[PDB]
Design a protein around this nucleic acid. Structure first.
Ligand SMILES: [K+]
Ligand SMILES: [K+]
Ligand SMILES: [Mg+2]
Ligand SMILES: [Mg+2]
Ligand SMILES: [Mg+2]
Ligand SMILES: [Mg+2]
Ligand SMILES: [Mg+2]
Ligand SMILES: [Mg+2]
Ligand SMILES: [Mg+2]
Ligand SMILES: [Mg+2]
Ligand SMILES: [Mg+2]
Ligand SMILES: [Mg+2]
Ligand SMILES: [Mg+2]
Ligand SMILES: [Mg+2]
Ligand SMILES: [Mg+2]
Ligand SMILES: [Mg+2]
Ligand SMILES: [Mg+2]
Ligand SMILES: [Mg+2]
Ligand SMILES: [Mg+2]
Ligand SMILES: [Mg+2]
Ligand SMILES: [Mg+2]
Ligand SMILES: [Mg+2]
Ligand SMILES: [Mg+2]
Lengths: 47, 139, 124, 183, 88
RNA sequence: UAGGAUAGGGGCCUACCAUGGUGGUGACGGGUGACGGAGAAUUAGGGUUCGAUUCCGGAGAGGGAGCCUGAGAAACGGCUACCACAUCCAAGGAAGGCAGCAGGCGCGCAAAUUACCCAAUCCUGACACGGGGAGGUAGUGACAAUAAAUAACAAUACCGGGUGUCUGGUAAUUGGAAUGAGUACAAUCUAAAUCCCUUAACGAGGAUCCAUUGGAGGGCAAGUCUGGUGCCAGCAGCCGCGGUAAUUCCAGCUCCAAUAGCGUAUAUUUAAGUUGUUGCAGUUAAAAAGCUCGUAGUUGGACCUUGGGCC
């Protein structure tokens, strides 16, 4: 039976994307990564 | 054990030549049977959707995999191709134009799907990924 | 100001000219036009006219403020119109450009190679 | 035939065998952080060049001392190192060049030298200034932060004449402000 | 294959003709002459690539036609004439 | 052996004669999705795989065959014939060969302009001068590859480390300066144009001048967060997940890896000391022939110049 194809995705609730400031790109992104992991790191990144 | 004579190069070479055949990969590559497979030594292929089918997943799993029976246009062989990305069976219609690719294990069934070695990559010249993410519409 | 320096200078007597690599140091400006440079070369090399001087193949160095190219000076204008390709004469107004298409000429050549006699030109 | 086909060409970085290792990831991120780089490629290419040099030196050291195909390129390699400010004057042997490391190379970059010469407030300000055509080595404008400086040119880095930081006219921001304040 | 060859590829030129690899697809084939065409230096490679007298394959001709070159006590015009060893 | 033919040797061909020639050191025959090489990829070393393609050699001009001219061709942008296609036609006849450049159809998973020029490299002709889809130049091009932007600094607010000061970090907070992506006089480039390099004038605050591709159970860096589904839909290279509390599915937030690059499929190098000459194994895991003889092959005891200087 193929009648249930695309069931959960079709029946899932829809929530719109948020709005936020863009992250720094390139050198500045590595700068903030280094600051977050070595400078102000004086235990999970997504606790 | 081994023949270690300095004058025994032919014996070692011939013995290794004979014994390479027990290798699974070497025998697979040098027997020439890879040309008798449906793809005939091609990375992708193109085909016509003959019908839409479902196959029950092998135990201990329990689900219905939405495959599709298609026919290749280069040699006429009929093969079953998986359709991933839930809801993507709706995009496929009858006698439709599809681009099929291997499943990942180089001529071996992947996952709990019994005897399926191909997956649908494109339909009607549009990628399933673009339709799934609503980046593109079927023409 | 603008300064000119000539290197690898050579008086080619076989072709009756002087050839050199010319370097223009031009701070404060984008480049020096060849028209504005021919008069300078004439005034520093005592060339009576301004047509025997040919300057070409210029290039600005990265960063700016410097350019280099090649230059030739001829003893006589008549000698000048004897050795250069016609395009360099065009650049200095010493010749006339002929507007033609190579493919059109080939078209005509193929068309008129079948006729025999003075009637070839008649098929116009 | 196409003559342009005859131009040689190659690749300069290699990528690591194991992509997800904590200690290596933190080491590379540490180096990138205080050397003001852009990605792991800017460091992988330095590793690649250092690996080539070390392999050449190791091959040379395997030969007999009295072998000319050791003396000649040993002298050449030591000359290049002493020319680029890597080996000190107290390290004139083929063994010292085997002990070279990546930070030795990264210390000779133009951005690093600009930062350490006091001309830049930080190693990121140095890269920004370099890429904005404010720095000249000797007399030549350089806008490539990876420019490896030599010892003889180490005493000539200075803000360019065209640069506002080296005696140039005000940039469009300052000129726009003066235009605004004019009326 | 069916006869003689009138072309010399730049990469097939003799080594002592130090020719820039990206200078063109062809090198000047040496003409038939006193020397073996592999131990010879054609006149094109004399007024050019050794002296700056000529700049192109258009001024070598422009100075050979003036009969300005006298190899081995004789005026020569063929720009690919094989001057090969100790020729004056 | 003697001739014939060829530019010339030769069973290359003819007459006569003799019975020889190659083969387990693989002839003969078959397969090749086989042009050969220089070389390519990966490589501790050894190695494994590939080599249509720009340099050298060979072969072909739809498939075979025959030939003229010419110093040179069994030539096909030369002829003659047959076979297969296919083109006008006044139906008597006539003319064909893109595996040259561009383009079209078809085949396919799969490949760009029916553009400009002889300015460069060279070649050819009676020739300094003509010509050159050879070759170069522009067009399309994320095959592959190099360098490299997407913000830097200060103040203020908040929070840390060496009662106090300094150091360090975050704020669609406040300031100023800097610059190229873009646009454009202009010159330069160019055979002529164009791109680049150089440069007037303009050109950044949410500097919207808005970074993406894959993931977040393990292998393997990153969530036992929230909402939906309920062995269904689906994910899952392997192990596995979902049966009302899902760290794995569908989404939001957050985080992770690479970053102008990333994912997927095939082929194959490593990993593979799982092809082992270097360097694997055979009592029980797969693997000593029931046993002996035996030719080829491989492998085979010891013994024969030292004192002698000089150098
Ligand atoms: K013969
Ligand atoms: K002839
Ligand atoms: Mg040919
Ligand atoms: Mg005979
Ligand atoms: Mg006979
Ligand atoms: Mg073949
Ligand atoms: Mg080949
Ligand atoms: Mg090709
Ligand atoms: Mg060839
Ligand atoms: Mg032929
Ligand atoms: Mg054909
Ligand atoms: Mg023929
Ligand atoms: Mg043709
Ligand atoms: Mg031909
Ligand atoms: Mg392609
Ligand atoms: Mg998730
Ligand atoms: Mg983990
Ligand atoms: Mg949940
Ligand atoms: Mg084993
Ligand atoms: Mg057993
Ligand atoms: Mg057993
Ligand atoms: Mg036994
Ligand atoms: Mg013995």
């Amino acid at each position: 039976s193929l009648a249930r194809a695309g069931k959960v995705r079709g029946q899932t609730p829809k929530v719109a994307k948020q709005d936020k400031k863009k992250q720094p790109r390139g050198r500045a992104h590595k700068r903030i990564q280094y600051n977050r992991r070595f400078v102000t790191a004086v235990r999970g990144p997504n606790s | 054990g081994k023949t270690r004579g300095m004058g025994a190069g032919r014996k070692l070479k011939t013995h290794r030549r004979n014994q390479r055949w027990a290798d699974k990969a070497y025998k697979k590559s040098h027997l020439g049977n890879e040309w008798k497979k449906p793809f005939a030594g091609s990375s992708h292929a193109k085909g016509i959707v003959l019908e839409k089918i479902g196959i029950e997943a092998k135990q201990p799993n329990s689900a219905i995999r939405k495959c599709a029976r298609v026919q290749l246009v280069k040699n006429g062989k009929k093969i079953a191709a998986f359709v991933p990305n839930d809801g993507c069976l709706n995009f496929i219609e009858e006698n439709d134009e599809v681009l099929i690719a291997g499943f990942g294990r180089k001529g071996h069934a992947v996952g709990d799907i019994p005897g399926v070695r191909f997956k649908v990559v494109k339909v009607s010249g549009v990628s399933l990924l673009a339709l799934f993410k609503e980046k593109k519409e079927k023409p | 100001a603008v300064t000119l320096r000539t290197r690898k200078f050579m008086t080619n007597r076989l072709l009756s000219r002087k050839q050199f690599v010319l370097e223009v140091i031009h701070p404060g400006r984008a480049n020096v036009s060849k028209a504005d440079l021919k008069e300078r070369l004439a005034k520093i090399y005592e060339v009576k006219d301004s047509n025997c001087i040919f300057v070409f193949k210029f290039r600005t160095h990265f960063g700016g403020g410097k350019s280099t190219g090649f230059g030739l000076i001829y003893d006589n204008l008549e000698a000048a119109k004897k050795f250069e390709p016609k395009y360099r004469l065009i650049r200095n107004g010493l010749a006339t450009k002929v507007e033609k298409s190579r493919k059109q000429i080939k078209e005509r050549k193929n068309r008129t190679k079948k006729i025999r006699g003075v009637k070839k030109t008649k098929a116009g | 035939v196409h003559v342009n086909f005859y131009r040689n060409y190659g690749k300069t970085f290699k990528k690591p065998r194991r992509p997800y290792e904590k200690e290596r990831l933190d080491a590379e991120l540490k180096l990138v952080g205080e050397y003001g780089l852009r990605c792991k490629r800017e460091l992988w290419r330095v590793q690649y060049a250092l690996s080539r040099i070390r392999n050449a030196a190791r091959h040379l050291l395997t030969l007999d001392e009295k072998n000319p195909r050791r003396i000649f390129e040993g002298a050449a390699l030591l000359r290049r190192m002493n020319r680029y400010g890597l080996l000190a004057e107290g390290q004139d042997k083929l063994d010292y060049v085997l002990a070279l490391t990546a930070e030795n190379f990264l210390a000779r970059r133009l951005q690093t030298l600009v930062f350490k010469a006091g001309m830049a407030k930080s190693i990121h300000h140095a890269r920004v200034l370099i890429r904005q055509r404010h720095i000249r080595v000797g007399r030549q404008i350089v806008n490539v932060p990876s420019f490896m400086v030599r010892v003889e040119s180490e005493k000539h880095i200075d803000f360019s004449l065209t640069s506002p930081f080296g005696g140039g006219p005000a940039g469009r921001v300052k000129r726009k402000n003066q235009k605004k304040a004019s009326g | 294959a069916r006869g003689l060859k009138k072309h010399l590829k730049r990469l097939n030129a003799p080594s002592h003709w130090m020719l820039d690899k990206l200078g063109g697809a062809f090198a000047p084939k040496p003409s038939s002459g006193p020397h073996k065409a592999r131990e010879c230096l054609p006149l094109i490679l004399i007024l050019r690539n050794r002296l700056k007298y000529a700049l192109t394959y258009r001024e070598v001709q422009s100075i050979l036609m003036q009969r300005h070159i006298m190899v081995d006590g004789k005026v020569r015009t063929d720009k690919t004439y094989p001057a090969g060893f100790m020729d004056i």
